[PDB]
């Protein structure tokens, strides 16, 4: 027990009704942290993500990416005829996204390492945007901002890399492709622009690559990712 915030309000760092300020509990959940609360929830539902509601107890996992420092999931407890509020939000770090922004709007909430305005490319074309990652350990966000259709469902499904010989490339599940476990996924939408990404923490068994396709009207593009280790 080293990454648990326990708040005891019923009958491993244990907080109680003393850490509250005016019956409020602002909780900064580190990316590698867990929060287990023990109380009787007012409406038995909460968190205006991955949460587990079990009897008079609740557990919440910190999301890898946070868009606005104000976004937060709020629980209200009722112990001994008293109301206590717990605000939970992850530590605000403006992580960059290692991918290609194909969209043209510049007032986005997300920052991409590479970018390629698909609106400018020729019709009936297929231009590539490559993104590479080369670290021993990873703690990065890889995604894209496509103003139109995205192929396949990225990044839960991905497109195999190109074959030198005349062999077909298929759609695979990212978990199998990069061969790691707790891959976190995240989606977003700014008007018509779709923002699909995935997180990656830890090392990697074998240097592998994949592709995700973005089409808009008669124009098309594709982002090729490559991550390495060992």
């Amino acid at each position, epitope marked *: 027990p080293h990454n648990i915030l326990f708040t005891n309000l019923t009958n491993p760092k244990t907080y109680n009704e003393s850490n509250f300020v005016s019956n409020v509990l602002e909780v900064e959940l580190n990316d590698g942290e867990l929060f287990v609360l023990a109380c009787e929830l007012i409406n038995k539902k909460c968190f205006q993500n991955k949460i587990i509601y079990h009897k008079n107890l609740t557990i919440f996992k910190a999301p890898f990416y946070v868009t606005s420092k104000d976004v937060n999931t709020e629980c209200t407890c009722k112990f001994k005829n008293n109301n206590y509020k717990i605000v939970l939000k992850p530590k605000y770090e403006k992580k960059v996204i290692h991918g290609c922004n194909f969209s043209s709007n510049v007032s986005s909430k997300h920052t991409f390492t590479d970018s390629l305005d698909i609106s400018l490319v020729d*019709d*009936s074309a*297929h231009i590539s945007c490559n993104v590479h990652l080369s670290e021993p350990k990873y703690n990065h966000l890889v995604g894209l901002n496509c103003p139109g259709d995205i192929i*396949p469902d990225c990044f839960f499904q991905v497109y195999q890399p190109e074959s030198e010989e*005349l062999e077909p490339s*298929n759609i695979v599940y990212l978990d199998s492709q990069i061969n790691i476990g707790d891959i976190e996924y995240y989606e977003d939408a700014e008007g018509d622009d779709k923002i699909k990404l995935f997180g990656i923490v830890g090392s990697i068994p074998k240097t592998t690559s994949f*592709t995700c396709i973005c089409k808009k009207d*008669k124009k098309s*593009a594709y982002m090729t990712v490559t991550i390495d280790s060992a």
Partner: antibody
Amino acid sequence: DVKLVESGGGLVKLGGSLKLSCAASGFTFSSYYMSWVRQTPEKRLELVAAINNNGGSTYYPDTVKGRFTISRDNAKNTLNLQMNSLKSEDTALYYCTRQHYGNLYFFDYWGQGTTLTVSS
Amino acid sequence: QIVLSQSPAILSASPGEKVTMTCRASSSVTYIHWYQQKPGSSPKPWIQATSSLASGVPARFSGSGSGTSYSLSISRVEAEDAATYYCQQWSSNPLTFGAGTKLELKR
């Protein structure tokens, strides 16, 4: 825009040989997988042969392997398919169509086809 | 070799009906391309990567499926949709097409 023009089709007697060519225009020919696909009288589409963007590697289904031979001249924007030892079953309309790795090998452009008749 | 079975062979429907054809593959395939062919012309790219619509293809068209069962669906059939539809795979050499589903529209 993009345009693919088959040519060279006609009547070949049993066991003969014939070369079909395809002219390409309106796109970067060197960056697209080309393929010859036929259509049988029973209205069935079949892949005859395919080639990669740089012309290096090629594939032929066992039905025609060794008998037919695809080729491409990127300097002339042309695709050729030398068919030898033609059998009556090869009677079909042959299309010249393209693909790209960046569109999940989608046949986004076909031709009007050139008609091959293998009979005596 | 992967055999692509298209059912029904002839799909009779009245305008507005919600119709769906089926592409059953012998083994599992990761995607299915869809092409529309109307007499006098070559096949036309219709549905890309199982579900993505080719440029200009009306929104009423839809594609779905996985493994050995894929499909193409029209929400409100229009008169202009009457044609033959072919499904195509290339998860393994060789790339194979389907027999086709010819769309009959009641009149």
